[PDB]
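Homework-ish question, so no full write-ups if that breaks the rules, but can someone show me the predicted structure for this set?
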Amino acid sequence: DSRDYSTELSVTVAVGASLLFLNILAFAALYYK
Amino acid sequence: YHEHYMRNSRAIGVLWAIFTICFAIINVVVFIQPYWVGDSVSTPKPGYFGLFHYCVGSGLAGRELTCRGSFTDFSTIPSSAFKAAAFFVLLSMVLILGCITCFSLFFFCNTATVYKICAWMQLLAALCLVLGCMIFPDGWDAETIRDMCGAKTGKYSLGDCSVRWAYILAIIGILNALILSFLAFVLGNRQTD
Amino acid sequence: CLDGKDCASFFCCFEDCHIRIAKMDSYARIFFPTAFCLFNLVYWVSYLYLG
Ligand SMILES: CCCCCCCC/C=C\CCCCCCCC(=O)O[C@H](COC(=O)CCCCCCCCCCCCCCC)COP(=O)(O)OC[C@@H](O)CO
Ligand SMILES: CC(C)CCC[C@@H](C)[C@H]1CC[C@H]2[C@@H]3CC=C4C[C@@H](O)CC[C@]4(C)[C@H]3CC[C@]12C
Ligand SMILES: CCCCCCCCCC
Ligand SMILES: [Cl-]
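A: Not a homework solution, just the prediction itself:
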């Protein structure tokens, strides 16, 4: 096995950034009077 | 204006619940899956380990990954720091599941009070997940971990091994929990208006 | 507390705070089945699929 973890970390960071961005959109919806 | 106000509050509450369930799934996955740290090209032996479970290769140019560890039996956990981290990551999971249970209180109890109850249960969950992430690196001196990663490994030092998806997913879970906690606080104060 | 409330007024419930004890049976009617259902979901998924 090629003991390299770059694609795995990349997809994990992508999913995490997506979820965090959705939560900042939730703040955007709230704080926008 | 008020009907738009109520519609936005309701929708954002629904999305907050959805993201709470997503974070609960993340917490369960990181607690269970043993992919917090893993071998590298320069490592002596192959394998990986999580909070309590660890799998190591015998060292014969094959997989043959002998696997040992279980949270039910605290004897098999390599070190005390691992035990403490596994406890905190569980207390965090039991506290996020408690909020998902407390969603049922929205029928009867005042909505602001329930929002704040989950705000405080999510804040504590993030604090536990943060204490669990700070304490887990302290057990990297354990001889079992040192045997796989190598001599260079130590307390608060990766050495030759590299972090795998579970660790960064737990960090993302910390951030998500904190953001959801503030979201719940703002929603709870927003229903009162 | 950017809303303009006190730290206590923003991050704590003190409007009347318990007083709602007669409705304890009402909460437990749906709380306890919900807790048991969640416990079974994590319990069975953990042992059969994840590990
Ligand atoms: C795979 C894992 C699955 C996990 C599933 C977990 C499920 C856990 C158990 C059930 C909880 C059900 C809760 C339902 C609550 C419904 C409550 C409701 O009608 O919402 C109103 C507004 O609240 C709100 O916007 C708050 C809304 C909160 C909604 C909470 C439930 C969402 C469930 C979404 C599930 C998606 C799953 C996705 C998986 C990926 C409050 O009422 P109401 O105006 O009358 O008050 C008037 C007041 O004077 C007295 O209460
Ligand atoms: C009361 C409600 C809100 C929360 C209940 C929390 C439940 C789901 C928690 C509490 C203790 C947990 C268990 C603790 C230890 C282990 C051993 C591990 O190798 C697999 C997961 C498993 C089996 C956990 C599954 C989830 C669990 C049963
Ligand atoms: C896809 C793996 C899901 C693991 C169980 C999720 C439980 C969420 C909290 C009830
Ligand atoms: Cl176990």
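Now go work out the reasoning yourself. Hint: Chain B has one domain: 2-192.
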